[PDB]
Ligand binder design. Structure first.
Ligand SMILES: O=c1ccn([C@@H]2O[C@H](COP(=O)(O)O)[C@@H](O)[C@H]2O)c(=O)[nH]1
Ligand SMILES: O=c1ccn([C@@H]2O[C@H](COP(=O)(O)O)[C@@H](O)[C@H]2O)c(=O)[nH]1
Ligand SMILES: [Mn+2]
Ligand SMILES: [Mn+2]
Ligand SMILES: [Zn+2]
Ligand SMILES: [Zn+2]
Ligand SMILES: [Zn+2]
Ligand SMILES: [Zn+2]
Lengths: 543, 543
């Protein structure tokens, strides 16, 4: 009998560019459309978006979109994805849509059909799908999980979550554990659950506790306080606004990215400054102990605000001895060096530096094992797909589920492109569809691929040597080096002879000019390797 | 009132390339000859060595050398340093000198005057200096701190250390806290102490505890075990050989680096294999649970042994489900991504993966705050130079000393090149000498500098377009690309129009060839920036 197909196109076996496809018959529902940020080896590129070959192929089957929350790994790919697809209904909570709308406006995309929903709303897609939204606490407001009701049963997707009893903003926001528990009693065929922190024992700390730690620290700061956190951590920022007021400090917000999230949050009633934000010039009128900066740059970006402060390149402010800088954040994996470098810059300036683990001034947005186990125990799913995690995270999430009273009948470790067939008693990967990464580099989408990146790597490691041989009047060779070594006239002449004698040997014994080009390349490679121990990229031209 | 000059040339404000200069009158004693390994922005280079300009200027004053232990950041620079200096006496413990002797023989360095010492020995350097060696436990055997006795008073240098009550090898190795306490009574004018773990609360775990943990884990492993650890962790590896024997496993050691430290340790009595090492062929004859591999690649190096295992490129062995892989190691800062990649490959293969913090299978070689506090308390120093750390470590070591019952009179945060004047009542930075880094890249020493690196970074990020224009017979342009973009005919045709017209427009008014470069190079970039939004490095050539 017809089965549900769950086809992740991004977000499985990685943390980033989340997009999941649900297909039943000839109807498709898509969930999120995130981006990913480039790793160190993906040099020069700006962002990464999902391959949507599947969706282009079946674009007439798409009934609509669900957007769980406004983080970049869930809505960042949308300008790129929507531009290639028919306009379809796109459902999300208010902050999420605010962020997407601003994003599409930057892109110049028009007539996108964004539909505001709220927790509890049940939305229908085509004839065989109904989605019901429910609240899960996360590190951004208006974050949803959903129950997807299908002819074969119910799929419960947690979205991104932690179980935070108190996010500290006085708005009574809590995860809808009652709805989750009910779904378990009703029957959950498939659980899709956030695996980010599946290797962390215990419970992720509460934002209320972080806020209390921050207030205690700041309360004891004698001078100015500079604080950095993620741009989109609206709860953390709001709580910081509240304690700043209590501690008699006015707030300056700096950094486009954070100002952008702040503006959206204020427009949707999730950010409420007790006192107006001030400019740096305005707070310059106050005493040091009355000053708090909230700004970007927690990941050590030299061009971000904290970056410019740490490197002494900020236009209007200079850090000094007696300042306190707080990193209310942790380095995203791969940013350790960048953050270490700014931290050391700060210590050399002489400012008091505050960061984890010495100070507990950050809580992750994701459930640790106790919280993951709670969702598993409440939902009691027959089948289980650990999601939003690299393989290490998915597999340890799967191991955690085995320890529980009522382990799932089968757990699968899905990969992007996997076709996961779901029936009342079916749970298997039946096949694969085209999936992967598309690089965005400046205006270019997909014009930079791995083969292009491979060159960039080689250039990066070994630098460049251009050998141009000129046959007339008498054959001579020309050497141009870029990022190879500093000028060395002796070696330059030495490289010329090696190429030349190979060029003359291709003339002493006639070969095609194309053949001789390869011959001198090989000679110069051998010499240089012996002479310098280096293997520079050599570009020979016999023209 | 002659003063002692303490001149760090490397190892202050960094972890790596330790070398410290002590000058009094016209006598110089040098301590250590370390390299540093490159960071991510120093692409393509193999290693980094100290600038020794100061020693070159003053080479006749050098009376002797002290070598505290055999780690790369204390002896790795020696082949490059000794080659430019007079052959002075070089004092060290036996394993230290065995490692140095191998290293110097590879470089062709003849007649280096290596002199073995033993703990407790007093070594005189000219009139002004007497040095006394003493034992500090570390993550390599034959590791020493020393007391340097000068006319102005006594300098105690901890060397690299932890305070490990039991390294587990049964040879009764302990730190000489008695001698250190006695130095405190005799009077310690200056204390130089290892700041590596100064931000870590508590006490670094004992190797004996790590060995017990490993044995408990390995006891439970149903099949083959693969364990990686630092090549020079002689204690850990010996402990593993003995636990392996007890658990009835035979041991294979692979990885050139590890075998190298193993051979020197064996030759100097610090490693005694209870059973002979077997080859991978030979263990292949045994049952799975009789097999233990000890190998390199703990840092994620794809070509190292664990690397090739994880990527499935090892010539003779293939990991499989049921295997257990233990990373008895932590990622050295900056290696997190490389190790994470290996770990995920291992999960995907399906092996059991054991690493910290989930399993306590690694302990640092360096003292945490409790151990640091002990040394400060025992030495009771008048002046304090926190050393072997980045500024964050140094300054946190300085704060730690302030919390203690008898804080130092003055503490300074030294930088490389600082002239620290030491008197009975003087402690200040009076001057600076030339200090810094020298890049080694293949055979070349100092032929790659920061300016060269800037280019490699540039190539790395934006790719390359070589652009050639010949005015004859009529103006035209030819293009070779590297790492810029995937082949696009429209883009390529369009770049030449900018390039050729600028040559033709440049041709209309007779122009110098160099003037053509400005129009030609300038034309493509102007266009290219509009077209792709990117700025590839361009090499203009007139044919
Ligand atoms: O806005 C965010 C927040 C978190 N993360 C990353 O996703 C994981 C979860 O972060 P958090 O939600 O726990 O802050 C972490 O690895 C973090 O680096 C992001 O990329 N962007
Ligand atoms: O390049 C290096 C080498 C060693 N360590 C330090 O060495 C300690 C582990 O002890 P050991 O086994 O490396 O001596 C760690 O705390 C680590 O900080 C570094 O940080 N960077
Ligand atoms: Mn780019
Ligand atoms: Mn190189
Ligand atoms: Zn999120
Ligand atoms: Zn997410
Ligand atoms: Zn060491
Ligand atoms: Zn060291």
């Amino acid at each position: 009998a017809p089965t549900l197909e769950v086809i992740p196109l991004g977000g499985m076996g990685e943390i980033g560019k989340n997009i999941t496809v649900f297909r039943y018959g000839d109807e498709i529902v898509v969930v999120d459309g995130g981006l990913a940020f480039p790793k160190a080896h993906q040099m020069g590129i700006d962002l990464i978006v999902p391959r949507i070959d599947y969706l282009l192929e079946h674009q007439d089957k798409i009934k609509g979109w669900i957007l769980t929350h406004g983080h970049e790994d869930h809505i960042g790919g949308l300008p790129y994805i929507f531009a290639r697809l028919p306009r379809v209904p796109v459902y999300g909570l208010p902050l999420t849509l605010a962020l997407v709308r601003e994003k599409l406006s930057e892109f110049g995309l028009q007539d996108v059909d964004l539909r505001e929903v709220t927790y509890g709303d049940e939305v229908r897609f085509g004839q065989s799908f109904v989605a019901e939204f429910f609240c899960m606490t996360h590190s951004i407001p208006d974050n949803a999980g959903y129950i997807l009701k299908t002819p074969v049963g119910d799929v419960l997707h947690t979205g991104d979550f932690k179980i935070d009893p108190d996010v500290g903003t006085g708005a009574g926001i809590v995860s809808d554990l009652e709805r989750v528990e009910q779904a378990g009693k009703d029957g959950v065929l498939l659980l899709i659950s956030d695996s980010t922190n599946a290797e962390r024992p215990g419970h992720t700390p509460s934002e209320a506790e972080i806020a209390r730690n921050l207030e205690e620290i700041i309360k004891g700061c004698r001078g100015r306080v500079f604080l950095t956190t993620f741009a989109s951590q609206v709860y953390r920022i709001q709580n910081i606004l509240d304690l700043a007021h209590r501690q008699g400090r006015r707030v300056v917000m700096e950094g486009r990215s954070m100002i952008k999230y702040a503006q959206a949050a204020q427009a949707t009633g999730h950010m409420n400054p007790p006192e107006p934000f001030l400019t740096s010039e305005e707070v310059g009128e106050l005493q040091d102990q009355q000053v708090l900066f909230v700004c970007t740059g927690s990941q050590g970006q030299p061009m971000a605000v904290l970056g410019r402060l740490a490197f002494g390149t900020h236009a209007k402010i200079a850090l000094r001895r007696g300042d306190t800088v707080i990193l209310s954040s942790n380095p995203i994996p791969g940013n350790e060096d960048a953050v270490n470098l700014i931290v050391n810059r700060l210590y050399e300036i002489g400012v008091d530096v505050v960061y984890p683990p010495t100070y507990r001034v950050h809580a992750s947005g994701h459930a640790s094992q106790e919280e993951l186990a709670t969702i598993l125990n409440l939902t009691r799913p027959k089948f289980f797909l650990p999601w939003h995690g690299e393989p290490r995270h998915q597999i340890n999430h799967a191991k955690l589920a085995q320890t529980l009273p009522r382990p799932p009948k089968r757990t699968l470790i899905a990969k992007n492109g996997d076709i996961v067939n779901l029936g009342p008693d079916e749970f298997r990967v039946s096949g694969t569809v085209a999936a992967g990464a598309v690089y965005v580099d400046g205006l270019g989408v997909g014009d930079v691929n791995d083969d292009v990146l491979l060159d960039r790597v080689n250039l990066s490691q070994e630098g460049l040597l251009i050998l141009t041989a000129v046959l007339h009047p008498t054959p001579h060779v020309e050497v141009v080096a870029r990022g190879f070594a500093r000028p060395n006239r002796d070696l330059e002449l030495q490289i010329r002879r090696v190429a030349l004698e190979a060029v003359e040997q291709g003339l002493r014994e006639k070969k095609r000019l194309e053949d001789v080009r390869d011959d001198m390349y090989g000679a110069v490679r051998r010499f240089t390797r012996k002479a310098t121990g280096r293997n520079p990229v050599l570009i020979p031209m016999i023209v």
